[PDB]
Amino acid sequence: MGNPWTEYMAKYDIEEVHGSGIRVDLGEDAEVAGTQYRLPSGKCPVFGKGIIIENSNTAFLTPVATGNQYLKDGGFAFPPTEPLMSPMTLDEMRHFYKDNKYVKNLDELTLCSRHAGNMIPDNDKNSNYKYPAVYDDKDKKCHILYIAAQENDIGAGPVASCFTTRMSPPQQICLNSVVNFCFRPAKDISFQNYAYLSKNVVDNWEKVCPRKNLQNAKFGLWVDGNCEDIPHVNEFPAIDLFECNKLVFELSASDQPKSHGKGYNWGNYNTETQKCEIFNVKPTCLINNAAYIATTALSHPIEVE
């Protein structure tokens, strides 16, 4: 008795390896100056996730609107600071943290998450509040998100104008201007190179988190020596894998006002019938079926292993 798949399938136990929402990650609370704020806390990167702002062509990685000029407009990212903390290229990150012996042998995504986590909302220097970030794998650039909300208590953090570094010797960094609208998370083709990163992304995410989809494989449940099919699935039409991953993402665990990672996080994509079969039970084995690709809401929407 027992399940021979246990070790290989640990990557797909979303409740354990990720532990928070996927579509909307607001799995923790942090105090800043006596006030509690929700913020993202998932331990895995979410590949291909971005935010779409309604009634706008403004990209969500545009810095948040500052000042009070007519037509002021912006996105979710940190505005300019002195010195400039965001966006920061991978090379800039490696050089500015060159004196921190612990950043060596951090991978690109982890380094971005830790850079974002360096800034403390200045009102509470003992605060556990850490901003999320988006890493652009194309331009190799890290964007700190000033607004942690993802759909619209909704994750809008403190209205901080000044920040202190967790890294010593401490530096204080303030915004160069004052900070001053419906939106939703999504996997868009234009987001395919992005990774959405909470403060909790683990150093070894490459080994414990799902990234690529599994070809010629179908998620199943281990039942007395056989890999049975998932008992209850929701079937949708999907012209290709990207559309199926987009759908799984839309239905996945969401903390929008805590999921703790529970939701419709997995999909079996039938490349022959062009059907996406989405379910909300953790899979415990894989079925050898040439027509299928197995995907999760966390996974890159296109890449296969």
Residue numbers in the entry: 6 to 157, 174 to 201, 211 to 287, 293 to 340
Question: What do the paper's sentences say?
Answer:
Here, three single-component AMA1-RON2L immunogens were designed that retain the structure of the two-component AMA1-RON2L complex: one structure-based design (SBD1) and two insertion fusions. We determined the X-ray crystal structures of SBD1 and insertion fusion immunogens 2 and 3 to resolutions of 1.80 Å, 1.85 Å, and 2.10 Å, respectively.
This insertion results in a loss of strain-transcending functional activity, suggesting that either the local structural perturbations introduced by the insertion fusion disrupt strain-transcending epitopes or epitopes within the DIf loop contribute to protection breadth.
